[PDB]
Design an enzyme around this catalytic site. Sequence first.
Site, short mmCIF file in Angstrom:
data_model
loop_
_atom_site.label_atom_id
_atom_site.label_comp_id
_atom_site.label_asym_id
_atom_site.label_seq_id
_atom_site.Cartn_x
_atom_site.Cartn_y
_atom_site.Cartn_z
N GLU A 43 26.26 22.76 57.13
CA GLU A 43 26.19 23.30 58.46
C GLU A 43 26.54 24.76 58.40
O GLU A 43 25.92 25.56 59.09
CB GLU A 43 27.11 22.51 59.36
CG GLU A 43 27.07 22.86 60.82
CD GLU A 43 27.93 21.89 61.55
OE1 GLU A 43 28.41 20.97 60.90
OE2 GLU A 43 28.18 22.07 62.72
N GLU A 93 37.25 33.74 27.36
CA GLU A 93 38.42 34.15 26.65
C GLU A 93 39.47 33.14 26.91
O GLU A 93 39.80 32.88 28.06
CB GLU A 93 38.92 35.50 27.11
CG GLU A 93 40.39 35.80 26.84
CD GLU A 93 40.89 35.81 25.44
OE1 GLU A 93 40.37 36.47 24.57
OE2 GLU A 93 41.85 35.10 25.23
N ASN A 120 45.43 36.93 46.22
CA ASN A 120 44.70 35.70 46.16
C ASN A 120 45.25 34.63 47.08
O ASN A 120 44.55 33.65 47.34
CB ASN A 120 44.61 35.30 44.75
CG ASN A 120 43.77 36.38 44.13
OD1 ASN A 120 43.06 37.16 44.79
ND2 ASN A 120 43.90 36.40 42.83
N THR A 157 31.85 38.05 32.88
CA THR A 157 31.59 36.66 33.12
C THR A 157 31.54 36.47 34.59
O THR A 157 30.76 35.67 35.11
CB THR A 157 32.70 35.78 32.59
OG1 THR A 157 33.92 36.13 33.25
CG2 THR A 157 32.83 35.98 31.10
N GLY A 182 32.39 41.82 36.89
CA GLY A 182 32.71 41.60 35.53
C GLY A 182 31.63 40.96 34.69
O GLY A 182 30.57 40.54 35.18
N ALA A 187 38.92 36.43 37.69
CA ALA A 187 38.99 36.52 39.12
C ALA A 187 38.68 35.16 39.72
O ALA A 187 39.38 34.69 40.61
CB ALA A 187 38.03 37.57 39.64
#
Lengths: 426, 426, 428, 428
Positions: free
Chosen positions: C243, C60, C217, C134, C132, C11
């Site tokens: 900021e 992986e 995405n 990782t 997940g 992801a």
Amino acid sequence: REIVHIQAGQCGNQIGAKFWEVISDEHGIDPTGSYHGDSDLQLERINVYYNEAAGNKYVPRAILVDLEPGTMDSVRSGPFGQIFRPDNFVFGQSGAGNNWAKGHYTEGAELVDSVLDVVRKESESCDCLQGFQLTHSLGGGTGSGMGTLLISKIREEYPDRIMNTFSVVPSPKVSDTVVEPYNATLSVHQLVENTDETYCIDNEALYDICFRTLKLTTPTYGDLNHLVSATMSGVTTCLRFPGQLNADLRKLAVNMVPFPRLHFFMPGFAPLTSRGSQQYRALTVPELTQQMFDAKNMMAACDPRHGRYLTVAAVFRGRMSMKEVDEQMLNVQNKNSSYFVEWIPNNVKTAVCDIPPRGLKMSATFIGNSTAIQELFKRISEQFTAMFRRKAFLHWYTGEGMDEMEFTEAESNMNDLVSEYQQYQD
Amino acid sequence: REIVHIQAGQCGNQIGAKFWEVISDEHGIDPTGSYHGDSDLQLERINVYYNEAAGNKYVPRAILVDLEPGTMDSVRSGPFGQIFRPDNFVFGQSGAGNNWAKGHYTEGAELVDSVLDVVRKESESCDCLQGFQLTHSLGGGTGSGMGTLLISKIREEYPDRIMNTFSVVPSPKVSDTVVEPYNATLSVHQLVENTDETYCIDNEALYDICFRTLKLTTPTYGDLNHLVSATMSGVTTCLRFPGQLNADLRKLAVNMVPFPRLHFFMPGFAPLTSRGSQQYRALTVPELTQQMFDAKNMMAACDPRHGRYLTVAAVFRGRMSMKEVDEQMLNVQNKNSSYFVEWIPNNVKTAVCDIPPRGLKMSATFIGNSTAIQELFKRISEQFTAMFRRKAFLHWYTGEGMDEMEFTEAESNMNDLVSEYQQYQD
Amino acid sequence: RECISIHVGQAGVQIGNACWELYCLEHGIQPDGQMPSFNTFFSETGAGKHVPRAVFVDLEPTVIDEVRTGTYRQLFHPEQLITGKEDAANNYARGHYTIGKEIIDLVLDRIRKLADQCTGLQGFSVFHSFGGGTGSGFTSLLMERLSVDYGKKSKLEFSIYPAPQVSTAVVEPYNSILTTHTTLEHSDCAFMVDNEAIYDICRRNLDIERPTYTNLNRLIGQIVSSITASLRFDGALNVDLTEFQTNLVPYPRGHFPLATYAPVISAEKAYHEQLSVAEITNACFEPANQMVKCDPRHGKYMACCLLYRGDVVPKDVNAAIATIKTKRTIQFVDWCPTGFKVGINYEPPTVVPGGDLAKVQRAVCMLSNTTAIAEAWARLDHKFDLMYAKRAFVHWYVGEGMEEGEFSEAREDMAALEKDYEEVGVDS
Amino acid sequence: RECISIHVGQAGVQIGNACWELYCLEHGIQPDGQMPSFNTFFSETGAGKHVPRAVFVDLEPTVIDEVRTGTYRQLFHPEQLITGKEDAANNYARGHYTIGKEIIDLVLDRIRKLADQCTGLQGFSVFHSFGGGTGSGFTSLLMERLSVDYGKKSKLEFSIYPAPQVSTAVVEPYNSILTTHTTLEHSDCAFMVDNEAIYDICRRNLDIERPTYTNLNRLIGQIVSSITASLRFDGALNVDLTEFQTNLVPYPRGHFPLATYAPVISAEKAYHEQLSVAEITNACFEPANQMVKCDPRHGKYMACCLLYRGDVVPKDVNAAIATIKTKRTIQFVDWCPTGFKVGINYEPPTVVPGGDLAKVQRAVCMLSNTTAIAEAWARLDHKFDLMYAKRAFVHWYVGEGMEEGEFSEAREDMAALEKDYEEVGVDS
Ligand SMILES: Nc1nc2c(ncn2[C@@H]2O[C@H](COP(=O)(O)OP(=O)(O)OP(=O)(O)O)[C@@H](O)[C@H]2O)c(=O)[nH]1
Ligand SMILES: Nc1nc2c(ncn2[C@@H]2O[C@H](COP(=O)(O)OP(=O)(O)OP(=O)(O)O)[C@@H](O)[C@H]2O)c(=O)[nH]1
Ligand SMILES: Nc1nc2c(ncn2[C@@H]2O[C@H](COP(=O)(O)OP(=O)(O)O)[C@@H](O)[C@H]2O)c(=O)[nH]1
Ligand SMILES: Nc1nc2c(ncn2[C@@H]2O[C@H](COP(=O)(O)OP(=O)(O)O)[C@@H](O)[C@H]2O)c(=O)[nH]1
Ligand SMILES: [Mg+2]
Ligand SMILES: [Mg+2]
């Protein structure tokens, strides 16, 4: 006789970008630095804001300060960014992020030493300073945070010079930082007693004027900061140029401050109307006085007729009769006697310069000190309290070491200014 | 009236490469040796540094010394390496390796006899020597090691001539040789009492200036040694050329040395700023004095306001009023009275030459003798002690016969200079 | 003025792929790094190639290999592409501990190398997913080290919010609960979005009933670019990342501002319709454009930040703010006055060639911290509880050295977090 | 200004092959000696052929024959190519004594002939390996004579450091222990590198998982050229070999500076990455580029020398030094101030056509004397001890006239050496 100006914060840097532009307009100085005017006066009193460097180059006596190179760069990239010397760009790296604590208390504090060193170098370059001016926002990190720190040190070095500042006051509707009232509160706590005078500019009011009387539908901050610079430049030119009345900034300060702590000002400006009506306007002293008195032509979101007027300064530019000015000011005093404070006889004071602003026949700057100003403080103080109780973003501030009791005292001090306005409101 | 210059060590040889270049610039002498100038003065006092050889060839009165032909060759290969006669290249074969013992005590000692013979030949070629000047590094093998040996013999032959030297002082950050403080310590031990005066040059400070005020991002040693040569050439030209004040090197030495042992100098230079700002600079005497006083324009990594000033020399080049110079120096004395030593009334002395450096309208050389100098000695002495206890690389030195008690005395002597600065620091 | 992007997990990396593609689109960067023209993110070579200052971590090989075989393989430095051989298996116990802990040292040294390449490290941000192995396991491991070395730098995290309805990871509650425990305490701010909510955006505003992650995405990338590219570019109000942190994080707990983005409009929807700044911001306070399935009307606001692209005049913004403050039903917590950060960049909004969103002339991103987030935690509370009461799947963690008490503890930490939201909700 | 290279043993000669190849590459020297253009190493003939001033010794014909049949066979003078018929058999007892002692007189006379060809012999350096028969046996024999005749000349040795994990010579500990005994006392400075560490460099910085000695020696050659070609060429700070000795050897024992070299970068790794002087020197203090498997962080520094090629500005160097002095974890021994030798040559770094390393514009070589070296001796101590306690292989030395006491003695000398490191570690 000379003035040093320091700009800070994104606001202050962009305002100054217009301010200096105008000053050079006034004197016929080219964006690249040399003088290409055409009037004797244009060079004659240039000293107050410029150093003539070898080659007939004029260096604006000002320091540009920020904690992000990119803003500075954008300033530098335009016309008149070339007139500033590299040595007047003092900046760090990593923002402030609109955090007072960073600006004042910790990180920005680190930069201030280098700023001040340059300040000292310029104070030596002057023959005789009249004073200093700073441009900044009240709710900003470097604008107010770091800027305030600097002010406290400059005042320390020069008690005998004028210390004033113009600052953007958080408008009721558009705050950017959630703790903008916090930063402002802290700046009052520090600034008020470390300055001779401060001007209150409200962007909201400015946006109303630009559409209300100027009937414009596209302004940007550069257009509104033009209006700001009109008032700033209005003040100092008279001091610079030949007039009739009494053209000294310190004397202005003396006439406008009745009490050590109440030195807040409401700027306004005339003439200030759209081109359509310019074919239907007459240019007389009463005309300017009508625009000057009218609260809608104030740049501060206050209402002078709500409060009481302590002091009024009317600065005129261009050829006017003394009689007419005297009479119209008297008339104002007479007709608006219900707003003036009875303790000060003839509370409306004047100053007259014979040089008109480029392109106009006449103009006038309104400076007032009313009690109405306290309303802004009240709005901030209230908002502050709510945030104070919750500590909103105060972990950022307390994380950088700012103590809540200091803030507590700041709150009191705001309330003190309000009570003192009440003490003289009567 | 004449001066002989001897360069030694890779440093000294490369500095001299720029020094002589400048001197010939000053007089319009071509890289090949003949005179192609254009001013009366250019030839008039040429005698101090050049012998005119048959054919209107000018021979620089200097000896180039090293223990590696390759460095000498590289010098010879450029312009102005052709102006030097082959007889001024005195060198051996096999380095020194930055080893004092080799340079001074043993191997380099062997070469010195041939060097001195040439020195003698030149001393005869002069009508009347004013003095000698040597260029070298304090932490180097031939620079300091062999160079020192030579100095002790020249002084012996000519007690009545000025013996001064300019030397690169180990910068706090960049030492090359692990025992660079050792070599320096030994050179103090030998040099201080065998010289009339020595100048302290810090490369680190020089690198700061070149970026700090000159805003340069590419310098090499040739660019920094240009700055060095500016100060060296500044001193002797006045002596050479018509001026107003008192233009004699010995007189300078007299005015700058209050005590037999404390003769260390901090050179500085004005004007010395980037081209951008040159359009924003004004050229006045106060302008030069501002640059001269400012510690950041010093070429020595010291801080004169930390210590006390014993003596100050202000040398000016170009047309200036006497009044202005007098007044500004007085002002300096007045405003920085807290740094000056009370025992010497009017501790700031001046010298004025009417010839500007080529390309500038005016210039000034700052020479100071402060107590702040002792800080450099302290840094070295400390570092020395640590090494001394461990004998780092001293097997190389003791292997060549250098005894540890001699080093012990050297350490004391360093400490003695510091204590004497304290004795007059008060 | 520099920053580091960190992409952990699929992801994290696949989102990153979109992000760096967009940055290339922002400046015309060629796949080989050649840029003819933003050095806050990039490091320059003598060839005029610029390297995105980012680290890609996958345990992986496959996803990184996808990068390595794509066009941007020339862009990324081989050392930026870090891969292990085996997975975390959806499991914090391996991601944070057993497996990921072996490679992390390498990862950190590449980070440190880049930190040394930075001259003025402003900070960094980490892209991952809350469920997940990782994605959340390794991620928190990293924070544990980064918060030591870079304690004063920006630690912004971006994570996918576990969809309440669809999740492919049966022990996601367990993973996310463990991350809460460890991220709350280390990170500065964590942002999140819900792919389910996004699907609704795609089908209603983009009119797309077939969204893939490569669409999803792109939309995320838009939001990210507004706060990453355009905050380094010129504007009226140039807002930095520090900021942002200084204007978005009100308490030392975490806080979790949620994303909202308007305009999200299909090309045809852009036709016949004129957006103003005010109209776009009106859309920003609509539940309909909320990127997380959580009802804005349920909770109360604590923070809100509006960031502007392209044709935005502060004048209009001011008016818009006035109306959102007064017209809307936005309840807000006492503590806060309405100091909403306004970032105003002149830098125009950009669109991915071949994407779904219409070319717009102005755009507004909204970050917000609402009390409704506790309901999201409530969701996790019960999901965790159910599993944990039965002790389903527990052996997959226990066998790696996890403790049952620890899991209880982590839940309790979440409960405490919910309680603090409760606290904030109580006005004072 | 001249020097002699001596190549003893295969390791010495094959490394030499790379070295002289590089010197040819430095000036465009043809295999026949024709050079169209460094006479410190070479001797000129009337044909414009230059002869490398070096001696090649092998007691087995084969390696020298390899030279004799290669391209550089025309370069080398037949008298420089000295060969025996039989080997030392991995054994000091034959290398130093029984076998090598027979031919050494010839060898010395060729050396002396070259010494007479030198006009200003600065010194020489010997290439060998710590474990072999001629590599270390014969080598020390030579030193025994050279230190008499050339007592005042540079005696620098370069040797392969026995890999802790792989060694083909079972009695290498014994050989190396005997050399310690005899080289410590005669030589001035001995440098060494670990082929295992180098493999790690090849696989991590060059990305090569197939290094052969012909790769490994190219890398060594780089390091050597920095200190041999470029120290005779022009620079800012022209450092001599005697200067090296005078700046690297702090005690009369030996000392053993270890090599580190950065840049070691594959062509692809060079792309997208800009090295500065400072960045390269940062790499020089990383364990990762340490050419010997010994941890720099374990010990304390005593000496350090940095030698620069190509585009190096002292200005940058100074800044770099400041940071390595203050930023790093480099602990150093009291005795020493940080006077690190900086050699700065304008002479650019060179690359072998068809090699693995990328063309670089600047380069830095680092020599360092760290207290961690005692651990290397500890390794030898136990390896020796084990064998010696069992007396395994002892008959292969005893039969040549070696004494058991001698072997004990040599170990003890090593122990003393370790103790002196201990001493230095004690700060004072
Ligand atoms: N928006 C978005 N969400 C994604 C993407 N890929 C996966 N997710 C979501 O993130 C979670 C999947 O995490 P995984 O891919 O199983 O695992 P990981 O976090 O990469 O690490 P491992 O479990 O060790 O493989 C699910 O909730 C997915 O819906 C993507 O490209 N975009
Ligand atoms: N770097 C490098 N190491 C080498 C090379 N050749 C051999 N070595 C190493 O040096 C040692 C081998 O020495 P040998 O080749 O057995 O022997 P020698 O020293 O030539 O002498 P003899 O034993 O008499 O043959 C081992 O530790 C090898 O790993 C080479 O070309 N390069
Ligand atoms: N008039 C005016 N106000 C400005 C400008 N820029 C920012 N402001 C105001 O300043 C406040 C924000 O502070 P800011 O200047 O960003 O703080 P800083 O940059 O961290 O010191 C808001 O109330 C803005 O309306 C400007 O160019 N003109
Ligand atoms: N300014 C300056 N310093 C130099 C030059 N060359 C070497 N140095 C300095 O001299 C010291 C080294 O001594 P070196 O000159 O090599 O000694 P020698 O050559 O053995 O006599 C270092 O501190 C260097 O910074 C140069 O050309 N200019
Ligand atoms: Mg995965
Ligand atoms: Mg062999």
